[PDB]
């Protein structure tokens, strides 16, 4: 009766910035998803392939829990086939994605008076991320023909930017915490199951 550590992911004190999104692997555990699906805490609960209930009756080779913070304005980018700054340069879901995207407003936790500057996102990148790719590059982005040699200036821009969450922002600009559960199924025997 080794239950999986979903509380460590959902009830964590601090969340990762989306460009450096956190991934925790879930293996050799009994998973009770009831705690999450019958929960009034979440504003977003989209499931692909699987159904949100149906869920404690299935098994999987591995479960990946990816956590980060974006603005609610961008939550709809966490979905297959989406485009935009977040989907292109921060966190990309595959087209055959089977899993659930769970999101909730976190203004009590991630907004600070005068701005919270600990949550960043990538604005500049040469090409789109592949599904489940992670880029923690900090190199100055060269927008012009002249190189930048680690110096900022015209046509040389830092590739990351702070969200700057303030509690007075509108709900569209407020911080939302996002957890993406991916259900990996392999040849190998299943290691994560519901109480079923």
């Amino acid at each position: 009766t080794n239950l999986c550590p979903f509380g460590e992911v959902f009830n964590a004190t601090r969340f990762a910035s989306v460009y450096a999104w956190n991934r925790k692997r879930i293996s050799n555990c009994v998973a009770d998803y009831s705690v999450l699906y019958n929960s009034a805490s979440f504003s977003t609960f989209k499931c692909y392939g699987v159904s949100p209930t149906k869920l404690n009756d299935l098994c999987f080779t591995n479960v990946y829990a990816d956590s980060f913070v974006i603005r609610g304005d961008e939550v709809r980018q966490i979905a297959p086939g989406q485009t935009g700054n977040i989907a292109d340069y921060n966190y990309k879901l595959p087209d055959d994605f089977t899993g659930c995207v769970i999101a909730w407003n976190s203004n009590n936790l991630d907004s600070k008076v005068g701005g919270n500057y600990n949550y960043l996102y990538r604005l500049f990148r040469k090409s789109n991320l592949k599904p489940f790719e992670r880029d923690i590059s900090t190199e100055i982005y060269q927008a012009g023909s002249t190189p930048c040699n680690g110096v900022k200036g015209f046509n040389c821009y830092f590739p990351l930017q702070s969200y700057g969450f303030q509690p007075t922002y509108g709900v569209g600009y407020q911080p939302y915490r996002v957890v993406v559960l991916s259900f990996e199924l392999l040849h190998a025997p299943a290691t994560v199951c519901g109480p079923k």
């Epitope: 603005r71 961008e74 292109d88 500049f124 040469k126 090409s127 789109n128 927008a143 023909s145 569209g172």
Partner: antibody, heavy 119, light 110 residues
Framework: EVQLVESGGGLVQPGGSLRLSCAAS????????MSWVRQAPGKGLEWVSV???????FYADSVKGRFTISRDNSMNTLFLQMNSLRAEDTAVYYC?????????????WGQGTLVTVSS | DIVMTQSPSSLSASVGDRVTITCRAS??????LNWYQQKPGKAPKLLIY???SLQSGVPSRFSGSGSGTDFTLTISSLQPEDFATYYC???????????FGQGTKLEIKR
């Protein structure tokens, strides 16, 4: 020095097609957010299209399904391919470089090219 | 679609005067508002970004302020070269949904 030069505008019959070009000099178009904005004669500015450095594109509702934005890196040129042109598309078309640092704003504009849709 | 309404539509003032143009957003856009200047037959020029940030190379007599739904562009001492049409532009959504105000035409009185 930085320059954006538009070309390819002219007379096009209703329902026809036309490809506008925007040659850039300072920045390299491949690595930049780029935008097409239009202005009907005597009226205001209307956003048309935008392309991200990764290649993802976005269009205003007035032109989706008819306009497509693209680029040539070796030519350092942005392109706007227009199909099924109507009379309401008659306008000056500007390309502009877009910076995403505080929302999206257009810090460098070309001088535009005129597109007249008439029979 | 966010609607940006500019006021007034037209305005005339004398050289050295202080001029204020207002622009109002249909919804909360925070400080994602830019101001552009367009002189006849020439390329539009960025004056202000981020509501109050003055763009590099733009004379200091141009000032931006506002937040939420109300914004103002101020010219502290009007110059003859400042005759033009001024446009506010919103960029609130993270997905491109840009909208412009209808523009204010500023002519010089002499």
């Amino acid at each position: 020095e930085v320059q954006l030069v538009e070309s390819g505008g002219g007379l096009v019959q209703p329902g026809g097609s036309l490809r506008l070009s925007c040659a850039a000099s300072g920045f390299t178009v491949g690595w930049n957010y780029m935008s097409w904005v239009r202005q009907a004669p005597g009226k205001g500015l209307e956003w048309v299209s935008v392309i991200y450095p990764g290649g993802t594109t976005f269009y205003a509702d007035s032109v989706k399904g008819r306009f497509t934005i693209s680029r040539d890196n070796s030519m350092n040129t942005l392109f706007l391919q227009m199909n099924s042109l109507r009379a309401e598309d008659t306008a000056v078309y500007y390309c502009a470089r877009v910076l995403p640092m505080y929302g999206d704003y257009l810090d460098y504009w070309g001088q535009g090219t005129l597109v007249t849709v008439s029979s | 679609d966010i609607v940006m309404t500019q006021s007034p539509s037209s305005l005339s003032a004398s050289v050295g005067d202080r001029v204020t143009i207002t622009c109002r957003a249909s919804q909360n856009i925070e400080r994602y508002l830019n101001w552009y200047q367009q002189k006849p037959g020439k390329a539009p020029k960025l004056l202000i970004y981020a509501a109050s940030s003055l763009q590099s190379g733009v004379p200091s007599r141009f000032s931006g302020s506002g937040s939420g739904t109300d914004f103002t562009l101020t010219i502290s001492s009007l110059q003859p070269e400042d005759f033009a049409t001024y446009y506010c532009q919103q960029s609130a959504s993270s997905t491109p949904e840009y909208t412009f105000g209808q523009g204010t035409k500023l002519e010089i009185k002499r």
